[PDB]
Amino acid sequence: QYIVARPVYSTNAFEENHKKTGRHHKTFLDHLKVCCSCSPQKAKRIVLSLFPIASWLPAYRLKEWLLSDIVSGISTGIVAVLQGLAFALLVDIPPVYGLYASFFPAIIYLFFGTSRHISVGPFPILSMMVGLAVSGAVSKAVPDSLLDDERVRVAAAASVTVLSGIIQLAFGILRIGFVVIYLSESLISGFTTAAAVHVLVSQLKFIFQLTVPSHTDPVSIFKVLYSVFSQIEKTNIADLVTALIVLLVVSIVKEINQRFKDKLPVPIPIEFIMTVIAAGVSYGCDFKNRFKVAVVGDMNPGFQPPITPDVETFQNTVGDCFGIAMVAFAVAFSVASVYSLKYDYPLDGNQELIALGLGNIVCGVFRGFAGSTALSRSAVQESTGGKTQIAGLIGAIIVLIVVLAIGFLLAPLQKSVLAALALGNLKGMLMQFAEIGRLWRKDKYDCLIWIMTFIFTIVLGLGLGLAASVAFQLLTIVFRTQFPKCSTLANIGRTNIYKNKKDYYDMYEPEGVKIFRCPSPIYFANIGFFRRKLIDAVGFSPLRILRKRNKALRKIRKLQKQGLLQVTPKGFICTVDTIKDSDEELDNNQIEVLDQPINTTDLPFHIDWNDDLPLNIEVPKISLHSLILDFSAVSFLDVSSVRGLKSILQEFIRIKVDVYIVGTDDDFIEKLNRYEFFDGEVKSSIFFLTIHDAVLHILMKKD
Amino acid sequence: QYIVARPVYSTNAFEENHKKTGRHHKTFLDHLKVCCSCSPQKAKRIVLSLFPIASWLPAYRLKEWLLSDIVSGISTGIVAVLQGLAFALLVDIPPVYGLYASFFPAIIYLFFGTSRHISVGPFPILSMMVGLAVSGAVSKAVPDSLLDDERVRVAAAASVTVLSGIIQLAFGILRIGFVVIYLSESLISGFTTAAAVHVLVSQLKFIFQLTVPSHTDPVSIFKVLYSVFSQIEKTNIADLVTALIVLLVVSIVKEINQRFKDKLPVPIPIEFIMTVIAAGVSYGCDFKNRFKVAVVGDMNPGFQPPITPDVETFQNTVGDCFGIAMVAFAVAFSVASVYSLKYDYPLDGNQELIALGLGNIVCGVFRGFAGSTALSRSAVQESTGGKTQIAGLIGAIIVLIVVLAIGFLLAPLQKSVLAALALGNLKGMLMQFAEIGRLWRKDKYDCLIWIMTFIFTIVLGLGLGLAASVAFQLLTIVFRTQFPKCSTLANIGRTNIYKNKKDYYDMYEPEGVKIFRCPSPIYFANIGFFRRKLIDAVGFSPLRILRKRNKALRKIRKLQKQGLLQVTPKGFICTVDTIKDSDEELDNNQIEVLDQPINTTDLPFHIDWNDDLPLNIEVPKISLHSLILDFSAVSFLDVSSVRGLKSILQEFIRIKVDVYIVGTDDDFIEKLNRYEFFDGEVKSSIFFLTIHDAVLHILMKKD
Ligand SMILES: CC(C)CCC[C@@H](C)[C@H]1CC[C@H]2[C@@H]3CC=C4C[C@@H](OC(=O)CCC(=O)O)CC[C@]4(C)[C@H]3CC[C@]12C
Ligand SMILES: CC(C)CCC[C@@H](C)[C@H]1CC[C@H]2[C@@H]3CC=C4C[C@@H](OC(=O)CCC(=O)O)CC[C@]4(C)[C@H]3CC[C@]12C
Ligand SMILES: CC(C)CCC[C@@H](C)[C@H]1CC[C@H]2[C@@H]3CC=C4C[C@@H](OC(=O)CCC(=O)O)CC[C@]4(C)[C@H]3CC[C@]12C
Ligand SMILES: CC(C)CCC[C@@H](C)[C@H]1CC[C@H]2[C@@H]3CC=C4C[C@@H](OC(=O)CCC(=O)O)CC[C@]4(C)[C@H]3CC[C@]12C
Ligand SMILES: CC(C)CCC[C@@H](C)[C@H]1CC[C@H]2[C@@H]3CC=C4C[C@@H](OC(=O)CCC(=O)O)CC[C@]4(C)[C@H]3CC[C@]12C
Ligand SMILES: CC(C)CCC[C@@H](C)[C@H]1CC[C@H]2[C@@H]3CC=C4C[C@@H](OC(=O)CCC(=O)O)CC[C@]4(C)[C@H]3CC[C@]12C
Ligand SMILES: CC(C)CCC[C@@H](C)[C@H]1CC[C@H]2[C@@H]3CC=C4C[C@@H](OC(=O)CCC(=O)O)CC[C@]4(C)[C@H]3CC[C@]12C
Ligand SMILES: CC(C)CCC[C@@H](C)[C@H]1CC[C@H]2[C@@H]3CC=C4C[C@@H](OC(=O)CCC(=O)O)CC[C@]4(C)[C@H]3CC[C@]12C
Ligand SMILES: N#C/C(=C\c1cn(-c2ccccc2)c2ccccc12)C(=O)O
Ligand SMILES: N#C/C(=C\c1cn(-c2ccccc2)c2ccccc12)C(=O)O
Incomplete structure (x- = not known):
């Protein structure tokens, strides 16, 4: 039977309790000293490989x-x-x-x-x-009996x-x-x-x-x-x-x-x-x-x-x-x-x-x-x-x-x-x-390579159809990873097994948690599709909620200058029953201040953004408070992925939704350290070992 | 704290105890009935998208x-x-x-x-x-004041x-x-x-x-x-x-x-x-x-x-x-x-x-x-x-x-x-x-795309350098996944965490088990490297052990016809102290019978292949009995991967080494069912949920 009793680890707490060996990986200048270092064994090993008949x-x-x-x-x-x-x-x-x-x-x-x-x-x-x-x-040939x-x-x-x-x-x-x-x-x-x-x-x-x-x-x-x-x-x-x-x-x-x-x-x-x-x-x-x-x-x-x-x-x-x-x-x-x-x-x-x-x-x-x-x-x-x-x-x-x-x-x-x-x-x-029938019923991406290689070779000649065929078989790798089947996961059997939400019957999701999975490396041909699938999986766009919250905060601060909202330690007093719905439109060169993070330190009252805002300010509510990304099949990112992912995580953090990236190895985080990815907002404490680690951390940190 | 008590699951035993919903996924002929089904809402939705000024x-x-x-x-x-x-x-x-x-x-x-x-x-x-x-x-233009x-x-x-x-x-x-x-x-x-x-x-x-x-x-x-x-x-x-x-x-x-x-x-x-x-x-x-x-x-x-x-x-x-x-x-x-x-x-x-x-x-x-x-x-x-x-x-x-x-x-x-x-x-x-410095210290694969796009555009013109640049940026995706950093994993802390064997200090491997991990999709440019890394990770080549076992079995069967090995219920009797080392060389058109699976049902004695074989037959011994492949970052296979992987698993099974593929989702196995992959030798019971599932199954099935 499967019986595990261990602490909840978070990929930084794992590396404080388990000492790494600290391998010194190899540079370039010693790559150019393993090649130029000649030896009487190396020379004979080379010249017996140049003349194998010896x-x-x-x-x-x-x-x-x-x-x-x-x-x-x-x-x-x-x-x-x-x-x-x-x-x-x-x-x-x-x-x-x-x-x-x-x-x-x-x-x-x-x-x-x-x-x-x-x-x-x-x-x-x-x-x-x-x-x-x-x-x-x-x-x-230039000009100068068969x-x-x-x-x-x-x-x-x-x-x-x-x-x-x-x-x-x-x-x-x-x-x-x-x-x-x-x-x-x-x-x-x-x-x-x-x-x-x-x-x-x-x-x-x-x-x-x-x-x-x-x-x-x-x-x-x-x-x-x-x-x-x-x-x-x-x-x-x-x-x-x-x-x-x-x-x-x-x-x-x-x-x-x-x-x-x-x-x-x-x-x-x-x-x-x-x-x-x-x-x-x-x-x-x-x-x-x-x-x-x-x-x-x-x-x-x-x-x-x-x-x-x-x-x-x-x-x-x-x-x-x-x-x-x-x-x-x-x-x-x-x-x-x-x-x-x-x-x-x-x-x-x-x-x-x-x-x-x-x-x-x-x-x-x-x-x-x-x-x-x-x-x-x-x-x-x-x-x-x-x-x-x-x-x-x-x-x-x-x-x-x-x-x-x-x-x-x-x-x-x-x-x-x-x-x-x-x-x-x-x-x-x-x-x-x-072989068109076999590859047709097997793959349909290699049947396409077969058919396009045949057609390119026939209608372009043996020299040029090969180059066109190599270019098309490089295109098919992008075709495979272009629209990945992105999933939302859920728990089966009240244990540490998380699978697709549409696949079994009695799944359970913790309230306020979304587990999203992209089963593909994310690169330049992939990141906009990933963002669209994440946005329609969570049910909203975090930029819209951030902008409407900033608009509501600007209207609240405008009503505070007129003395219409006397702020207490708790609750707005609202010394007007109803104002006549004066919405204000910002100019260009000024609209991007709606994308700034909210810092309501000037008010002692903690603004909730989810119960009710006074004087009929709608500001649409979300039930999400934690998002888990299952990056276990994500093999690499390049540049566009790191920029788009940094944008996604920054937009999610600014509306008070905790993000967790889950399932990666140490090489993945070691490559993300080079990308200028971590800062004062996106910290390295968002990485966890498994999905159940992040879920147990969420349930412990709530209550 | 992380506390889990569940049965050991094997991706077939998981689907007998958890009923799937049975989704009927969509065909082609109904893809051609969602497009041709016109409606007064669909027509106005189309013609307001063709004329957005309306x-x-x-x-x-x-x-x-x-x-x-x-x-x-x-x-x-x-x-x-x-x-x-x-x-x-x-x-x-x-x-x-x-x-x-x-x-x-x-x-x-x-x-x-x-x-x-x-x-x-x-x-x-x-x-x-x-x-x-x-x-x-x-x-x-053909020929017929500025x-x-x-x-x-x-x-x-x-x-x-x-x-x-x-x-x-x-x-x-x-x-x-x-x-x-x-x-x-x-x-x-x-x-x-x-x-x-x-x-x-x-x-x-x-x-x-x-x-x-x-x-x-x-x-x-x-x-x-x-x-x-x-x-x-x-x-x-x-x-x-x-x-x-x-x-x-x-x-x-x-x-x-x-x-x-x-x-x-x-x-x-x-x-x-x-x-x-x-x-x-x-x-x-x-x-x-x-x-x-x-x-x-x-x-x-x-x-x-x-x-x-x-x-x-x-x-x-x-x-x-x-x-x-x-x-x-x-x-x-x-x-x-x-x-x-x-x-x-x-x-x-x-x-x-x-x-x-x-x-x-x-x-x-x-x-x-x-x-x-x-x-x-x-x-x-x-x-x-x-x-x-x-x-x-x-x-x-x-x-x-x-x-x-x-x-x-x-x-x-x-x-x-x-x-x-x-x-x-x-x-x-x-x-x-x-941006050459930023992309140089960030990625070095997108710096290469930048430099080659600049050079191709300069020395080939704006029309042709773009096509050459697109072809080279398709090449870089193959360059990223060409030589993946393949790993051997081991256990840390006597729990369900398995990481790289060279990375921490007090790792533990179960005796006779090898856990191999390829952190990349395996395709045509990848499968020979994967086979070479698996062979030098396990320490031997299974084809060589299979061929030397078949040669030893042919020599044993030849000595049985001469009455030199009278077979008992246990042990060979060996009624010669020492024969004079007559090795026999097979012809071509006959050598591939060394690659056939061993079926020693004609002898009542169970041949061990690991202790000692009589009359000085060496037949090199292995300590491996179970191999676990961590296919969690393997996003896809194509055709060459399925052929090479089927060859690898067939060579490992025939020398009595159990193989386990671990970490995949249901879409992966559903695609492998189309590839004519499973047969009487490679069964679908080799798939497990996690690495700890396979390790606990191995330790239970040994003793
Ligand atoms: C890494 C590998 C792919 C390098 C292979 C290099 C060759 C493809 C290059 C190197 C030297 C080149 C040659 C250098 C000089 C000339 C002379 C040039 O002719 C002239 O300058 C005058 C004579 C004339 O063309 O009328 C024609 C091309 C040619 C043969 C070049 C043909 C292409 C060559 C053999
Ligand atoms: C892919 C990597 C290994 C680099 C390969 C480089 C080659 C594709 C280049 C390098 C040298 C080039 C050659 C350098 C000089 C010449 C001479 C040049 O001669 C003329 O222009 C003669 C006058 C005329 O043609 O009108 C024609 C192109 C050619 C053969 C070039 C053809 C393309 C070559 C072989
Ligand atoms: C794999 C296939 C199904 C792809 C599509 C095939 C077409 C690209 C082929 C089929 C018929 C071919 C044509 C068949 C015959 C001729 C006549 C041929 O005429 C000559 O060589 C000289 C004529 C003269 O004397 O003036 C020129 C190529 C052409 C037009 C061929 C051009 C290429 C065509 C249109
Ligand atoms: C799937 C896609 C990428 C297929 C693309 C096919 C084209 C690259 C083919 C199809 C029609 C072909 C043309 C069909 C007929 C002719 C006439 C033919 O006329 C001749 O000069 C004949 C020989 C002679 O008399 O010298 C020259 C090639 C050409 C332009 C062919 C050039 C190559 C074309 C454009
Ligand atoms: C999916 C998209 C990319 C389709 C785009 C198709 C066009 C690139 C094709 C379709 C019709 C083609 C034309 C069909 C017929 C002719 C006549 C042909 O000329 C003749 O036959 C006689 C006149 C002469 O060339 O002297 C020259 C090419 C041209 C304009 C073709 C040019 C390329 C065109 C516009
Ligand atoms: C990538 C997908 C969207 C397919 C694109 C197909 C085009 C690249 C093909 C289809 C029609 C082809 C044309 C069909 C007919 C002709 C006329 C043909 O005319 C001649 O050969 C005239 C005589 C001479 O040039 O000597 C020249 C090639 C051309 C323009 C072809 C050029 C290539 C075209 C535009
Ligand atoms: C991004 C760079 C570093 C890549 C490598 C650059 C080369 C491919 C360039 C640099 C110098 C260039 C040459 C500079 C000047 C000339 C003279 C030029 O002469 C003419 O146009 C007419 C001459 C006449 O009147 O006969 C022809 C191109 C050529 C040989 C250029 C060919 C391309 C060259 C070798
Ligand atoms: C990294 C690799 C892929 C770079 C490959 C570069 C080649 C594609 C370039 C480099 C040298 C170039 C050549 C340098 C000089 C000339 C002479 C030039 O002569 C002219 O006709 C000049 C203009 C005129 O008088 O009409 C024609 C282009 C050509 C052959 C160039 C063709 C394109 C070449 C082979
Ligand atoms: N090899 C061999 C034999 C016969 C030949 C095979 N092609 C051939 C033809 C197309 C593609 C590839 C090969 C020949 C060509 C000329 C004359 C004889 C042969 C044998 O003797 O069996
Ligand atoms: N836009 C704008 C303005 C001036 C211009 C910008 N380019 C340009 C030049 C290269 C690439 C791309 C653009 C001009 C070109 C001609 C004449 C005026 C302009 C402005 O009024 O600020």
Whole structure:
């Protein structure tokens, strides 16, 4: 049973009887002495965190991990080759520059990366963003043969990814890799669903084999849909039927694959099989002069010399590279967190930013495009038994073998087989459309974030819809705390339990006491609503009672100068039966003296303000004498709240109503001490521990 | 004294013994039957709120208010004439179009407005915004004598203000006039200080008499400063010395004016006096051919016929007109709220939006620019004794007399006297620079809002810095709740008071109980920090203990198949002294079975997990058996919080640690019922009333 016998405490009387420890909290100048104090332990702890390969490579279990890493590396390197060739088409550069995007960041991440299970390379949302930034950068260059219009796109892609890597590396150095908390899962879900719709639309010009101009920012998906479906009569039917056959086979076998996972080890590489079959039947049957199928061209065997990034492209694409860097880091951290939770090893977000930025810089210098991880390729690497990032090294070696030696193969590949392979794996992102119903019946504030993120991304493009979506998801936090359900409380069962007055049957309120509760932090978007709810909860406005009391006092003092009210020790004598109702109106520059506190020390008689005032002065009466504010769910105040609350409490104190703030911790009062809140009128003795403390104090101080 | 004797309640046992009232809360379809249910009382209540002049005009006290309204109307009409002429220069149109800006909204607001003390007209921040929007609109028009370049600016100004009035009227119709709560007072203070710096810079080309091109959006103030100070050798010294003399005299007399306010009724109109003296000495001495002073030209006597707004200017200036409408409504509501609080009458914000939008539409049709109220002119109207909006009618009649009849006067006015009069009244907005110190020592989150609003407005212009400032002040709410000071609580004095464990001396914790407190709402930017703080507060991670227990159970079950552990009713028999430490590593696709709940029903012996496990199996021990979460300051959860909290509680329950959530109201649990939160593992019986309830329940259920 609950049995408590203690004294009534008042948050000052609690601190006289219970000695505090007196903690000396930390300043700024010693925050700048814990950072600059270097040590031989601190330096080695830093340089083993900058080069994580110095810590996991000598701890390699080369009896339990090597064969699994080799098998997983081969199985992810084949997928990396095909995905690089397919994602180079979304940037509209020659396809061999896709392979450079799947080699250099995977080599840099082996040395500088902290995850063990992600596969580093291109992924289609980032490749679409890089393609849109290139189309925006070549449409803004100053002026000074379709081999030279793609030589500009390659240099623009290289410059965009060098700038994105520079931004990522700078944010990793500045230790602000915690920015991934500013994206909710509803925002990520809506953004990835709309990006899957963007990817699905962008692969239509390769299936139908049409020529679509490179549209730009505001509504890119509808311009591309119009330019595709206005030329639908020029559709090459061989590419269409080949893409449909490859798409049907890869979706059927990818359903069969995960439908039967207990019986099937190292799952079926149906995309490699269909690519081999399609390139082998396009060769031999000569699907380039019988029909007019566009193929992957003759890729040159070898790497290309490094280029210097153009500062004009740096100037024209600053916000595009900011969006590319943010989306790349957010996707990589979201994918790597799954496997770090699954296998229990720590992830360093700032080291992730440093490794991805260095990989993107080295990739863009040697003419590749932007890299992060993909969820699909990382799932392929982890599903086949990847243990460390040596599987990434074997995958990069497979990409290297394809670049240097076997590049005469993949030349009869039909360029719509790649689009069909990219369309066959949009299923996981398109199945997120069944989340509007769940979030609708769950929250309705995150369903709004989902729907507005989808709409903003669709009708504003992948770079600008993300910024608008982040701003709207910041608005929804204000929407949650805008009109809080403010309550009046009452006692149940004649004990220390106080709940909502409209919720149970036999509640009891002490006479003259009001207990008000705001279940929300009070800030600038909240304080006027709080004042309105408090005023209609107590039943009156204290400013009106104060002003009418001041008007009555001015009329009483005016009648005292005329000798009409001879003041006794008790009671006014009233040596007139009735005066003829002369009300006096004050001017402006003089009305604010009605808001001053009443000091009736010149009369020996104590004016009651509640019984009856002589000579027909109405002065409306109140029954309230004590007000309790339950500030237990109020997490913070800012400035506007402290001003408005100081005004409310000053207006309540001046009409002789005691106020009590109840339910706060010591940090709340310690922050209120900085706000110039307490003075000779609002004292610190209004704070109490619990509601029952204040109620017992009221009942003791009355009688 | 505090004496309580009650049973221990558990938020389900409280609702079996206290019958709820069962309120039927309101749906959507009856929200759409309270709006469409029309009545003869509802219709008259609506149409008396659309035309407020039908309610205050027959209640006019024409014995106490008429002379004061006449005097205040004359005193504000003279100021309205001079301010209209001065603010027409910030738009760079001829000055007579300033007077039309101070006539038509003041006439429309007399019929449709709810305030009684504001003066409607131009104010310099809005006139600078209209000038910037005109300069941006004439720099974007398609192509098809300095009399024709200002005929384009007049039509662009008219179109911009018609679109701003349309936006204001549409937002007043849609009942969303509560948007003024989205601007903190720190944002308004920083914005108005930077706008005062903009106004001070924009009046330099009229004092020095220079020719400055109409610069635009990104850094307008530095381009204007460069274009002024590169031509400083061409300064007309007569305009300079006249502006300095007028500025010195008006600042000295405006200090003298409010230094002595008790002795001085109806304060000194020093601006009217200096304008009369300057125009009378510029005439007669002929300050137009002796020197080369630019003067206010010959204004044509009369109004101008209405024009149709160009839809090209509507197309080019959508965001500019949105910013103009928002700033006009915010300034007007902030000024009108002061006098509504001072004189105790209700303000309707949506009717304010409707009246201002109609006034701006009618003003822009008849070739004026945008209108709202100014704080200075409203202070002049209220200080001289304005009672109703009939003072606005007398002011508009004074402006009408100046337009129709006396326009041959104000023709020798020196056009830098007006700039000096506008510079002499920037003191109130420039004295807000002494708020970085106050907000620095008070909050440091609103000082940041002030500084970033000032910087964004200065280096981005008045339209775009406001949007960036609103986005940053939405970011600061996330900054406040990002890393909450999470605590571990303990008991003081062997009663029902639980406070921070590091704060007092003789605290007591029950053995095996941890009380954790997060003093913040938990949302998407908050849940990973909450999980990290809970894990390092309890001293371990429950996933690691669960996985190591599952590994130990798999090794025990493997040794049972070999007959090495013959299970008794109690104790393992262990018919081997020591096996040679064969640890087994699981594959991927098989590791997640370490996260499954332990069901050791196949053994009759109860496995302890805390004493000793045979054959040297370590399985790290915990002393915790009960965890209490103090969710009293947690105002809301969203989706990510419910998922992360469900994960945390499921991981704690599976290692046989009872969890208790404590301190919530019934609305919190009612919202958690929608989230698919409770199941066969996480039940609703974990919720308790207070911390002492849960602690007494723990101590009763142990022994
Ligand atoms: C929920 C709210 C925030 C949605 C707001 C949507 C607007 C941002 C969209 C809807 C209509 C769009 C417009 C629809 C059509 C066009 C014509 C289009 O014309 C072209 O130049 C086509 C391509 C070419 O030929 O170059 C340019 C974009 C534009 C102005 C669009 C700009 C973006 C707009 C205004
Ligand atoms: C998520 C959806 C429901 C939000 C609302 C969608 C609208 C903003 C979309 C739907 C139809 C779209 C239009 C569909 C087709 C076109 C034609 C397109 O034309 C061209 O690109 C070139 C035309 C030419 O050759 O002149 C320009 C965009 C536009 C107007 C689109 C503008 C954006 C619109 C109005
Ligand atoms: C904390 C992180 C986000 C810092 C990242 C900083 C970069 C975004 C900045 C720093 C240096 C900047 C560069 C400094 C100088 C120039 C040269 C400038 O060009 C010229 O002055 C002449 C050449 C021309 O534009 O024709 C174009 C912008 C650019 C590349 C700037 C682009 C933006 C850069 C890379
Ligand atoms: C959010 C925090 C990390 C600060 C980020 C700052 C950047 C957004 C700023 C800092 C340096 C700026 C650059 C400084 C100099 C230039 C050169 C400037 O060049 C010109 O004006 C060339 C002539 C012309 O464009 O007509 C164009 C803007 C730019 C790229 C600026 C773009 C915006 C930058 C990258
Ligand atoms: C705290 C952070 C967010 C501040 C970010 C500041 C930037 C938004 C500013 C700083 C430097 C500015 C630039 C400084 C100089 C110029 C050259 C200026 O050149 C002109 O065209 C001058 C006028 C003309 O001759 O037409 C155009 C604006 C620009 C690019 C400015 C664009 C806006 C910039 C990038
Ligand atoms: C609140 C402050 C401390 C924030 C940082 C200020 C900078 C963003 C400012 C300070 C100096 C400014 C510059 C001062 C002078 C000029 C020259 C000005 O030149 C012209 O307008 C035309 C030049 C020509 O004739 O070619 C263009 C803007 C610019 C570069 C300004 C760009 C913005 C700058 C770098
Ligand atoms: C809830 C509130 C914010 C609604 C406010 C809506 C306005 C901002 C919209 C509604 C109608 C729109 C107009 C509808 C049609 C046109 C014609 C359009 O021009 C043309 O189609 C041809 C002429 C040309 O531009 O050359 C230019 C934009 C404009 C004026 C639009 C400007 C923006 C307007 C006024
Ligand atoms: C925030 C809530 C209240 C919604 C606000 C919606 C507006 C921001 C949208 C709705 C209608 C839109 C307009 C619809 C049509 C047009 C015509 C369109 O004309 C052209 O594209 C002409 C050709 C060219 O510019 O090259 C330009 C955008 C504009 C003004 C749009 C601008 C953005 C507007 C005003
Ligand atoms: N990963 C993996 C596999 C196949 C592919 C997945 N996408 C993809 C498509 C859209 C979004 C994200 C990923 C491919 C793209 C081209 C060629 C092959 C694939 C596998 O072998 O299972
Ligand atoms: N109001 C009032 C008075 C004088 C003026 C105040 N500004 C002003 C200037 C900047 C910002 C806001 C206001 C004027 C402008 C032109 C001509 C006269 C005035 C008064 O007569 O006291």
